[PDB]
Amino acid sequence: SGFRKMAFPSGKVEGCMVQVTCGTTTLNGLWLDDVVYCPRHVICTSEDMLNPNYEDLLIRKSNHNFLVQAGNVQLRVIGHSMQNCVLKLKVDTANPKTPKYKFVRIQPGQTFSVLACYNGSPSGVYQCAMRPNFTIKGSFLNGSCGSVGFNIDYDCVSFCYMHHMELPTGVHAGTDLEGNFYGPFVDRQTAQAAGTDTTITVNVLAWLYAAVINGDRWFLNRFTTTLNDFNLVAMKYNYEPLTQDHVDILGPLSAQTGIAVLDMCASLKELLQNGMNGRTILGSALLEDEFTPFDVVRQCSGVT
Amino acid sequence: SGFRKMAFPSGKVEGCMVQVTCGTTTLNGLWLDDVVYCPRHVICTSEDMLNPNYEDLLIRKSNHNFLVQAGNVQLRVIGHSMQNCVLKLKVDTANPKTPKYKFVRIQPGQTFSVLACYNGSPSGVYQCAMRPNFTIKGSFLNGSCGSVGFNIDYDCVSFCYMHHMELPTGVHAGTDLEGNFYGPFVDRQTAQAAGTDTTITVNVLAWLYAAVINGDRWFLNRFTTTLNDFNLVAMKYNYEPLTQDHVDILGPLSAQTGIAVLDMCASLKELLQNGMNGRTILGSALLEDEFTPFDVVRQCSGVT
Ligand SMILES: O=C(Nc1cnccc1CO)[C@@H]1COc2ccc(Cl)cc21
Ligand SMILES: O=C(Nc1cnccc1CO)[C@@H]1COc2ccc(Cl)cc21
Known part of the structure; x- marks a missing residue:
């Protein structure tokens, strides 16, 4: 009896959340096995976000510039690479709480749960749909970048979304876990049209x-x-x-x-x-x- | 930007869910420290639910009749007691995943998250309000009894609700974690008036x-x-x-x-x-x- 907008239980994902800091920018990362995934704009200042040259900005960064923390646990970064709009930071320790997982690119109209996080700490969970125009109508403030969307099929977490940006209209845009944006969006502070929904x-x-x-x-x-x-x-x-x-x-x-x-x-x-x-x-x-x-x-x- | 009906992250509560079986009835229990809490109607058959004499029904049960399982983990029951409408099963092992917690009786109009569970396994999380008439409009099917409602204040889970019953109107009734019903409800299969909401x-x-x-x-x-x-x-x-x-x-x-x-x-x-x-x-x-x-x-x- 009853029907609610239900999210998946978030525990398996909470165990993967970390804080990533590069310079003065802090956002969330997803630690799965020995890799931490996060939005590549962690390497930008606000001055850079106008039209960032990510390749040049990343060249100025070394492994030791990416500070990754999971509560008290400080992670040692032994590699870094950019894949599309995500950074992949190789760490020397596999996450002991890594659930069985997959990376999936969802279709527009599919639903998923979002674990909203700030500074690597989970704040809430909600269910939403990927709009037909590839935006999501979420609840995200500054510091929520790197929060992820997922579905669960028995013991397997399928991660489908990583949060990157709020459009000037107040709707949200992000990528799959390979760093490809859903929709026409680019990770730059420029007004960008979301299609007709x-x-x-x-x-x-x-x-x-x-x-x-x-x-x-x-x-x-x-x-x-x-x-x-x-x-x-x-x-x-x-x-x-x-x-x-x-x-x-x-x-x-x-x-x-x-x-x-x-x-x-x-x-x-x-x-x-x-x-x-x-x-x-x-x-x-x-x-x-x-x-x-x-x-x-x-x-x-x-x-x- | 954006505003969603957000639930608390459920991980701390997922770690507490167990399955309790007594005879032919299976429902969910909450394992905190060395005690498992569950609805007392786990000791009833469908025949008993018409007007159960819980004191007499519990007298026919011994510690070994309460089967408590947390995935593969079988718990050894070393004591049992009824407090209002909940049973408290003392187990020989403290739950290693017990979060910092409190038991609170919420006021009508307050909100909380529900972790809907079946057979001790979490299925989803949603936020709801305790109605002014002490019912909740949840999403619960048979087997969801023992699922709990909670709030989180930093690292502390305040458990406020345990699910017991669906009223003939399709709304839900349950107790605080001391087994006291919210509202005028009794744990018996009789049509019961929920007040004017x-x-x-x-x-x-x-x-x-x-x-x-x-x-x-x-x-x-x-x-x-x-x-x-x-x-x-x-x-x-x-x-x-x-x-x-x-x-x-x-x-x-x-x-x-x-x-x-x-x-x-x-x-x-x-x-x-x-x-x-x-x-x-x-x-x-x-x-x-x-x-x-x-x-x-x-x-x-x-x-x-
Ligand atoms: O959008 C942003 N953050 C944000 C996300 N979600 C919610 C809120 C905020 C900031 O209030 C930042 C600020 O502008 C840009 C431009 C491009 C990117 Cl990829 C990221 C950002
Ligand atoms: O209500 C019930 N279960 C239930 C709960 N939530 C949702 C669904 C169901 C059953 O479909 C059972 C069946 O009737 C009684 C009467 C009293 C109590 Cl305390 C419990 C129950």
């Missing part, structure tokens, strides 16, 4: 299924629609066009509830065209798109 | 301050109100009456933003009387009451 249709439908499962059913109607008709409505309301691949991933929810995917699309069509009429769905007065169909299945079945 | 006014005001801090300002107006006038509106809309104690705790947010508490009350008054007019505040289309003023200060300053 859309609502993640398949996630809204998944959440409507979660609502029916939990007893919020008022939005179910006597109608049906087609993918074509539904996509005309999706385009009008800036929703992602629904494909057969999205219908296929909604199969388990359709099977469990007995509500055909296109019938749920007709409920979503009516909600887009008429609004919620002052009512709520799972405690929300808007259509929620931060739950994937897999998240709904996991939460509704009790997966650990 | 109200919206946590001081938390809505705190969240409006968080909104202004983050740039959502459209709801600020040219008006002011008084505590008396505001409380007539609060009563009409089923909000908690605002007191000077609530105004006092909003002091830091008022000081930081320069918006007097009674001016923010006039914005809240206009939102109650006129609705949101199809607009949103911090990504919500309703007035959010699950952030306390302390939560807003912590999140807006970056506390670890």
